[PDB]
């Protein structure tokens, strides 16, 4: 059973958070409907194509379990298709600039009147009521805004993006919370809700860690466990020591544990050549015994200025530098598998090579290969939510406007009224 | 009113992936139990404490909205309390090591018998019938198993983790859409379901952007948008030139766009002494004119080796390192207003301290101060989901057992039944 068969949704989105959020409902069973432009369609289409005048892989992957339409709304005969839309649809969603469905006369007032059991919901940059409410906003400007550069890369380079999705996807995925938590309000009171999720928030959800860092930093002074606390380990660009001294805003640390456990990012054989061979390694207080093994160094068990959280800090990366060594002729899974007899959370740096070709991702469905007749197949992310009782079936991405007379039949207009559509370029 | 009001959830979560899940669904409405070890409960209560004897930022940032029993389940008398409450639940959510729930004999197929409405939702490191399906994981090593690692940081470092909880938080979201999806499931079949996010597939659903770049990367040999396309501008640490000639897996690009229009992380006023002095700053293909206006470079419009993405491929840095002369003595909230007046996405870097204070983020419920008269008031994140008929309330987190006697009275147990308990020490 799909948990949203019968989910009817008006698929207003472009780029990437909006579509991962419809793309998602739509591997779960909802019934998707994309609106495009006329001519070029969502931006995405024409997006880094690997193929000229062939839908790229930006749009494919972010746009399968979906039909499209176009329409022209700036025209009243697409407003008034849209309406329509809008009686037949259980949520609306849209992530098109702040303001820009509300100038085509789509507020949320209006759209509660065209039918009180829909849900709008949307993505922007920033919330409703925010100073910057009315910016436009890509990915690494939300990673920017939320925290995570700030506190991502090292104490002596630049504020770092994230090669995961946190102002993109990572919005689509919270938006997707607030739709099925305003389904659930539905089922209650019959009636729809607007939902949004703003990028800036969405990213800071996931920095939660470092506004405890934040408020530590405030209250104390320190964070023992950052590298900056550490005697002269850490160095400014000067060749001077850092410290907490002088610092009042969660630093970078490199590649420490953040909200795990203290841990290392270390090299293995061929790093040289090979940017991904490396393993990280958490060095717990649950497992302290454990790990003491491995290096077959027993003289850390009696002392008690190694085995204690506080009785360990003084020598944190002097432990990392250690082992380095000991890694040094052995792969990522050799090394992995090495300490892994002694249940430590140590493990690989997967490359985006290895992880596309894994036959356990494969088998769990979690990377898909999308049957695509038109185009190819191509690989995809699946569903990262697993369930006994039922299983995503995923289907090639739409060609633009490929479902436009399919769709304006369904809505019960005739052939002829088509044709009129179609010559007066609003479809 | 709220989403989740009426839903019991049967909490034995601890860390952060699934306390963060449980959380959140208490921001929505939720009766959440959190279920704990007697004497030590949750780790995250005793782990990075800024105040001893003080339950930890760490825990009250996660644990809101939450009420605490205490409860030795490894007793018989408590397995018998675990039934009555399974038969009151609608959600029983758990991480453990990935076999621990059904060690304590309470396997799915037992909590079916007990109650055939409950979900059971479970978050674990990999995914079930992966070859990695046993491992204990934390924060970074899902990071280094997603993919995110690999293509997180600059081509001549280390894999590079996220400040953001990729890994734990990350996972936690993605398994609140996954118990919403089972409660959708369950509005039309009257049965509960068992849902799972494993990490390494929180983690690579926020990266499939990248694995759009693998595949681009297989079939075409270049990645256009990438530092590395630009002749003769990126080399490793021992000075060798980096091409897509050489590269066979996506490579990590500094900051570059992402699922974004090109961009890059430009320097401000004073960015040798704030580590946070910097901007975001898109060159999107529809802007180039505008850009021009802004660096005061008019002969740059029409010329086909800057007016188009393809014509940038070329020395795309070195527009990015001339624009970043236009910010030197302006700061980064002067240059994001600055790029807004041409409708350029740019904004600042925020420091988590600057995050902390700002009204806006306050003024919408996403900073929310939470009133705790035991440990001091604190900070923590509220919901990044916003709805125009309901509005969370948020409570502090409960102390170890605070609510053990409130909850099992509310089972039905009478007061010389709740005596004996504490007396054979189950409770
Ligand atoms: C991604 C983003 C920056 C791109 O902005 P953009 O390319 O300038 O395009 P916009 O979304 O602002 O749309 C431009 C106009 O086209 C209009 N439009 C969109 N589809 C149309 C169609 N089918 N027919 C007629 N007009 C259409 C919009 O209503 C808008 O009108 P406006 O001039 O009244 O503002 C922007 O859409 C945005 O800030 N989105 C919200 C946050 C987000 O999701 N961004 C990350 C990308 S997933
Ligand atoms: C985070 C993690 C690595 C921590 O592992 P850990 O420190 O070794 O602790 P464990 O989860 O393995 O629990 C140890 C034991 O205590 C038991 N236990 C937990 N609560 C108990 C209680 N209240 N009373 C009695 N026993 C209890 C568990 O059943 C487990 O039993 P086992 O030895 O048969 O396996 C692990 O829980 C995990 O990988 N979680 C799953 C995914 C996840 O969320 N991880 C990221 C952390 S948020």
């Given at each position: 059973?799909?948990?949203?068969?019968?989910?009817?949704?008006?698929?207003?989105?472009?780029?990437?958070?909006?579509?991962?959020?419809?793309?998602?409902?739509?591997?779960?069973?909802?019934?998707?409907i994309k609106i495009e432009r006329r001519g070029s369609g969502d931006?995405?289409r024409?997006?880094?194509?690997?193929?000229?005048?062939?839908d790229?892989?930006?749009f494919?992957?972010?746009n399968?379990?979906k039909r499209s339409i176009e329409l022209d709304?700036?025209?009243?005969?697409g407003?008034?298709l849209?309406?329509?839309?809008?009686?037949?649809?259980?949520?609306?969603?849209?992530?098109?600039?702040?303001?820009?469905?509300?100038?085509?006369?789509?507020?949320?007032?209006?759209?509660?009147?065209?039918?009180?059991?829909?849900?709008?919901?949307?993505?922007?940059?920033?919330?409703?009521?925010?100073?910057?409410?009315?910016?436009?906003?890509?990915?690494?400007?939300?990673?920017?805004?939320?925290?995570?550069?700030?506190?991502?890369?090292?104490?002596?380079?630049?504020?770092?993006?994230?090669?995961?999705?946190?102002?993109?996807?990572?919005?689509?995925?919270?938006?997707?919370?607030?739709?099925?938590?305003?389904?659930?309000?539905?089922?209650?009171?019959?009636?729809?809700?607007?939902?949004?999720?703003?990028?800036?928030?969405?990213?800071?959800?996931?920095?939660?860690?470092?506004?405890?860092?934040?408020?530590?930093?405030?209250?104390?002074?320190?964070?023992?466990?950052?590298?900056?606390?550490?005697?002269?380990?850490?160095?400014?660009?000067?060749?001077?020591?850092?410290?907490?001294?002088?610092?009042?805003?969660?630093?970078?640390?490199?590649?420490?544990?953040?909200?795990?456990?203290?841990?290392?990012?270390?090299?293995?054989?061929?790093?040289?050549?090979?940017?991904?061979?490396?393993?990280?390694?958490?060095?717990?207080?649950?497992?302290?015994?454990?790990?003491?093994?491995?290096?077959?160094?027993?003289?850390?068990?009696?002392?008690?200025?190694?085995?204690?959280?506080?009785?360990?800090?003084?020598?944190?990366?002097?432990?990392?530098?250690?082992?380095?060594?000991?890694?040094?002729?052995?792969?990522?899974?050799?090394?992995?598998?090495?300490?892994?007899?002694?249940?430590?959370?140590?493990?690989?740096?997967?490359?985006?090579?290895?992880?596309?070709?894994?036959?356990?991702?494969?088998?769990?469905?979690?990377?898909?290969?999308?049957?695509?007749?038109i185009?190819?197949?191509?690989?995809?992310?699946?569903?990262?939510?697993?369930?006994?009782?039922?299983?995503?079936?995923?289907?090639?991405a739409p060609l633009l406007g490929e479902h436009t007379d399919e769709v304006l039949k369904?809505?019960?207009?005739?052939?002829?009224?088509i044709?009129?559509l179609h010559?007066?370029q609003v479809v």
């Amino acid at each position: 059973t799909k948990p949203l068969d019968g989910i009817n949704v008006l698929d207003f989105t472009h780029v990437q958070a909006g579509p991962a959020c419809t793309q998602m409902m739509g591997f779960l069973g909802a019934n998707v409907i994309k609106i495009e432009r006329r001519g070029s369609g969502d931006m995405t289409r024409g997006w880094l194509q690997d193929k000229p005048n062939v839908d790229s892989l930006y749009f494919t992957m972010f746009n399968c379990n979906k039909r499209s339409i176009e329409l022209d709304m700036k025209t009243p005969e697409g407003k008034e298709l849209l309406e329509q839309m809008i009686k037949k649809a259980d949520v609306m969603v849209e992530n098109f600039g702040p303001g820009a469905l509300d100038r085509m006369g789509f507020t949320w007032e209006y759209i509660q009147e065209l039918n009180p059991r829909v849900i709008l919901a949307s993505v922007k940059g920033y919330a409703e009521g925010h100073a910057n409410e009315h910016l436009k906003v890509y990915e690494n400007v939300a990673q920017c805004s939320g925290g995570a550069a700030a506190t991502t890369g090292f104490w002596d380079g630049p504020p770092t993006v994230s090669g995961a999705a946190l102002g993109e996807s990572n919005s689509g995925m919270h938006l997707m919370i607030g739709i099925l938590a305003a389904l659930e309000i539905r089922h209650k009171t019959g009636r729809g809700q607007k939902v949004a999720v703003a990028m800036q928030d969405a990213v800071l959800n996931l920095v939660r860690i470092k506004l405890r860092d934040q408020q530590r930093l405030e209250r104390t002074g320190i964070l023992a466990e950052y590298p900056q606390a550490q005697p002269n380990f850490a160095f400014d660009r000067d060749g001077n020591p850092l410290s907490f001294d002088n610092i009042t805003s969660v630093p970078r640390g490199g590649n420490a544990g953040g909200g795990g456990q203290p841990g290392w990012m270390l090299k293995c054989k061929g790093w040289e050549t090979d940017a991904d061979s490396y393993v990280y390694f958490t060095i717990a207080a649950n497992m302290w015994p454990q790990i003491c093994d491995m290096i077959d160094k027993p003289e850390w068990k009696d002392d008690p200025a190694y085995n204690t959280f506080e009785g360990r800090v003084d020598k944190l990366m002097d432990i990392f530098s250690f082992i380095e060594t000991k890694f040094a002729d052995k792969d990522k899974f050799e090394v992995t598998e090495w300490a892994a007899q002694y249940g430590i959370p140590c493990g690989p740096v997967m490359s985006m090579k290895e992880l596309a070709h894994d036959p356990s991702l494969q088998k769990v469905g979690t990377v898909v290969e999308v049957v695509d007749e038109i185009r190819g197949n191509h690989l995809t992310v699946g569903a990262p939510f697993k369930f006994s009782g039922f299983q995503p079936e995923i289907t090639r991405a739409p060609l633009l406007g490929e479902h436009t007379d399919e769709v304006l039949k369904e809505l019960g207009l005739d052939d002829a009224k088509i044709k009129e559509l179609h010559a007066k370029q609003v479809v």
